[PDB]
Amino acid sequence: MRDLKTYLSVAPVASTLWFAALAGLLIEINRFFPDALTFPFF
Amino acid sequence: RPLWFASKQSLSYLDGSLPGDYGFDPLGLSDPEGTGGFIEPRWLAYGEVINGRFAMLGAVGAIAPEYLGKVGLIPQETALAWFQTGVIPPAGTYNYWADNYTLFVLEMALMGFAEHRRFQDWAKPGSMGKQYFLGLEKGFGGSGNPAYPGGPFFNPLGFGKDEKSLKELKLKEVKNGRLAMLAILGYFIQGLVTGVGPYQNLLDHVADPVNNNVLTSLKFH
């Protein structure tokens, strides 16, 4: 548990989880505001 | 004490402390040399006894209904072969008070508590007579030997109060267990390649032996 928490924070696993979260975020963002070549709000 | 197809390696670990010890181990499986998971000799003895007991039960039970299916008030809907009971649906089913799946899960809930308690006694012997179980724990103590727990439940009639009694009785038990085990194997293969049912099939064999094992050589189904 403590050691599982440690292993889940080793560099490869920390980075894969981080990048999976980032990928999910970007994917959803472009799923809501697709085909965006500019910033049209202000 | 007489010996069958013994081995010098096999004889070493099979000297006679166990019932039915005939020194027959042509593949040398109860070797106390390589004891690990599920190959330890005590566990193999326990397994032989338990398989023999369940096989005696199932071997008088599988042949029963289709015997008195011929004698007595017992109807014919209650008179199936052992394979038509719903155990193998593609070979015949029945409509009991339940579904045959709830039947199974209820069966295995009951068998679950009985088997788990029995194992809890095998592993740490004498542990079931400690925790509360609606009373009834003083009877689940055990006797040090797993295959022979004894007590007020598993031995109410008190057979074998001296120990040669228990010796020859254990010998008879394991012998009848081996008999019932190979009887059940015969049931299985015979009900497959002849597909008749053992009791009725036995009656056809006793008509006259024209119908030999080779005759159903041809694997009707």
Binding site: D3, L4, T6, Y7, V10, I27, N30, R31, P34 | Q9, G28, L29, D31, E33, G34, T35, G36, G37, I39, P90, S217, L218, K219, F220, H221
Partner: protein
């Protein structure tokens, strides 16, 4: 002396202690890291069990459970394939009409416009056309619904779970000991008779009851949903008696020895099914039956526990003669104490086997509707060729590792190994000469043809019309094969393939399954090119193995270990003088050889076999026999093969084959990228990282794990792996895009 199960209880307790600690096996790693090089080492020596310790028992226990883990991975992959065929496929539509619907078992999500990859594969379905040939396997096994595929996927999932659990169990709870592994007699007895004998007998049992009747029904034209379920064919037997009358006697023929009464479904026809374009299933069943009998007898050769059998030591040490001294005496002791010897033998044999499989599968298509599925055929051949080549190179790698680490004449002396080590120089010199001669007289012919053609002198060219180099031996052999059925294989009706000859073209759905393949001068030239490339890669690998311990250059090469950068720029320069470096080259030359082989196959097939048949029997091939006249000069390969065939992939953009164009370009990129690692050295890079580190330190952002440039060996490893990835991937994209567009 006798053989038994011998185990140890709970050798290592399952725990999360060592997961928290990175490189626990290596003492130096366990402590922690000072620089960036430590991270690379952690991965490079993860599975080198024989250096984490010296105990053979521990090495072998680790090996056993790692094999279990690998089996679990394979099962998960299989279950994924079956589930995708069950859920995201058009397998039933394809089953209704095989030669119009394109198989595809993968769809994509519409996220960034990538749904264009969901192309029209027909059947009211839009997905990515697959080349795995899985539909053909499932059809040949008798699978008609997707319920069966679902059940298969779930069964393989629980099998993967079982394999993973067994891996945990046999390492942390009940781990065998050394005398159990070192028993190879019983192990061979069980793998020959039990794994291959019972396995193939069981498969023949499947085909006799499931695939034969169901495929009979499918080829009779029955709607796939109107076919009886397979278990019916077991319950009701007259269902089989209708298709196959001699299922009526029912196994009494098997014991009367009236085996001829089984001639219905146990045939020896040979050739192809004119309806499906595959081998006769009644032939494949008979084949597996005979295979089973053979393996079941063969797994009874070695003695285990009952006196009868063969002691492998006796067989080995019985073989010796006047040229080899005491040969084979001492090999049994070598092949049972070193895992690397076994690994290299098995790798060589498995690579050989994979390539034989590729050839035989292209020549005698075993699955229905496989031959006329050109994409599947091309992909299967190419994939198996690559796998075989890689395995064969690994064989050499591990032979060298053995020679460096485990070879010891003080305690384990063998005579043959010693003699070969003693005349390695003669061996390598003659192999060198053969490589040179073969390279001059195969590629030199191509250069001569190119200049003869460029100087407007085609009569002087080595071609079918100017100076013929006819492969008379191959022509003679294949004519002997064509005449075989009836003359010298009386029980066969058709020759074993249709590439032998006899006419008898077979087509399916207006496409050519097979026809006799002609061998001309271009075949001679390219076969000698093949011989040349194979000989050169053999030279590199054998030179690496034979000179792994010592040479006339550096006299103590074994003390430097199996893998190392160099021993300084002394004696003129000793760059890559190690055995590992020889494997690095062999991979380059293996790439060259396999690339030429698959190019030859693809061009020859698109030029002389594949194509479309028509009403008169006029066969228009993909390229009108342009291989016989254009493949004899390098300009022909560059123009008629690469430039011509390459147009399909370039025009892929804007369609559903766009991903292949993208992968074409990306593979070009990564291949070119490898050259940065393959042409440079780590000194320049260390000196550049120095100033980058300065830039970081100036802003208090320098890392504590000091960044080092990669090792010399790692740089070569990065360079060779990227090179192979790039080249193989660009060939993959080109082949797939071309054969899916023109096929």
């Amino acid at each position: 002396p006798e053989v038994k199960i011998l185990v140890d209880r709970d050798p290592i307790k399952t725990s999360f202690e060592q997961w928290a600690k990175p490189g626990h096996f290596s003492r130096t790693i366990a402590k922690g890291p000072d620089t960036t090089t430590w991270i690379w080492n952690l991965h490079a020596d993860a599975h080198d069990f024989d250096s984490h310790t010296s105990d053979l028992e521990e090495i072998s226990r680790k090996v056993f459970s790692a094999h279990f883990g690998q089996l679990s991975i394979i099962f998960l992959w299989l279950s994924g394939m079956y589930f995708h065929g069950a859920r995201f496929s058009n397998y039933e539509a394809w089953l209704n009409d095989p030669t119009h619907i394109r198989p595809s078992a993968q769809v994509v999500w519409p996220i960034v416009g990538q749904e264009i990859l969901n192309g029209d594969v027909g059947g009211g379905f839009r997905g990515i056309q697959i080349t795995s040939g899985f539909f053909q396997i499932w059809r040949a096994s008798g699978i008609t619904s997707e319920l069966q595929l679902y059940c298969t996927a779930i069964g393989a999932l629980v099998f993967a779970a079982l394999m993973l659990f067994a891996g945990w169990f046999h390492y942390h709870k009940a781990a065998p000991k050394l005398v159990w592994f070192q028993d190879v007699e019983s192990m061979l007895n069980h793998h020959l008779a039990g794994l291959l004998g019972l396995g193939s007998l069981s498969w023949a049992g499947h085909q006799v009851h499931v695939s034969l009747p169901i495929n009979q029904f499918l080829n009779a034209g029955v709607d796939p949903k109107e076919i009886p379920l397979p278990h019916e064919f077991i319950l009701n037997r007259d269902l089989l008696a209708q298709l196959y009358p001699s299922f009526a006697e029912g196994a009494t023929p098997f014991f009367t020895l009236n085996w001829s009464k089984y001639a219905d479904f146990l045939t020896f026809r040979g050739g192809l099914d004119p309806l499906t374009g595959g081998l006769w299933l009644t032939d494949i069943a008979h084949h597996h039956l005979a295979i089973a009998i053979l393996f079941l007898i063969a797994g009874h050769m070695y003695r285990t526990n009952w006196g009868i059998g063969h002691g492998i030591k006796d067989i080995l040490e019985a073989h010796k003669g006047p040229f080899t001294g005491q040969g084979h005496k001492g090999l049994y002791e070598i092949l049972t104490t070193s895992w690397h010897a076994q690994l290299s033998i098995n790798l060589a044999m498995l690579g050989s086997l994979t390539i034989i499989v590729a050839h035989h599968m292209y020549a005698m298509p075993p699955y229905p509707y496989l031959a006329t599925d050109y994409g599947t055929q091309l992909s299967l051949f190419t994939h198996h060729m690559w796998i075989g080549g890689f395995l064969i190179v690994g064989a050499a790698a591990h032979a060298a590792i053995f020679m460096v680490r485990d070879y010891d004449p003080t305690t384990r002396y063998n005579d043959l190994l010693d003699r070969v080590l003693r005349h390695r120089d003669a061996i390598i010199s003659h192999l060198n000469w053969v490589c040179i001669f073969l390279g001059f007289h195969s590629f030199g012919l191509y250069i001569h043809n190119d200049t003869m053609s460029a100087l407007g002198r085609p009569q002087d060219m080595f071609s079918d019309t100017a100076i013929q180099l006819q492969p008379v031996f191959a022509q003679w052999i294949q004519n002997t094969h064509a005449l075989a059925p009836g003359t010298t294989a009386p029980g066969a009706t058709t020759s074993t393939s249709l590439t032998w000859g006899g006419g008898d073209l077979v087509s399916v759905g207006g496409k050519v399954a097979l026809l006799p393949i002609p061998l001309g001068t271009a075949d001679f030239l390219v076969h000698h090119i093949h011989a040349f490339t194979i000989h050169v890669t053999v030279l590199i690998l054998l030179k690496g193995v034979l000179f792994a311990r010592s040479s006339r250059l550096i006299p103590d090469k074994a003390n430097l270990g199996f893998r190392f950068p160099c021993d300084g720029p002394g004696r003129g320069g000793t760059c890559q003088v190690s055995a590992w470096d020889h494997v690095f080259l062999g991979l380059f030359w293996m790439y060259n050889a396999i690339s030429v082989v698959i190019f030859h196959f693809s061009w020859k097939m698109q030029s002389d076999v594949w194509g479309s048949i028509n009403d008169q029997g006029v066969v228009t091939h993909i390229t009108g026999g342009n291989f016989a006249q254009s493949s004899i000069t390098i300009n022909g390969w560059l123009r008629d093969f690469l430039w011509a065939q390459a147009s399909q992939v370039i025009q892929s953009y804007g369609s559903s084959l766009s991903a292949y164009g993208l992968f074409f370009l990306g593979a070009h990129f990564v291949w070119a990228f490898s050259l940065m690692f393959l042409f440079s050295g780590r000194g320049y890079w260390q000196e550049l990282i120095e100033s980058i580190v300065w830039a970081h330190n100036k802003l208090k952002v320098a890392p504590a794990t000091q960044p080092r440039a990669l090792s010399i060996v790692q740089g070569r490893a990065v360079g060779v792996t990227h090179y192979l990835l790039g080249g193989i991937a660009t060939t993959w994209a080109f082949f797939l895009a071309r054969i899916i567009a023109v096929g």
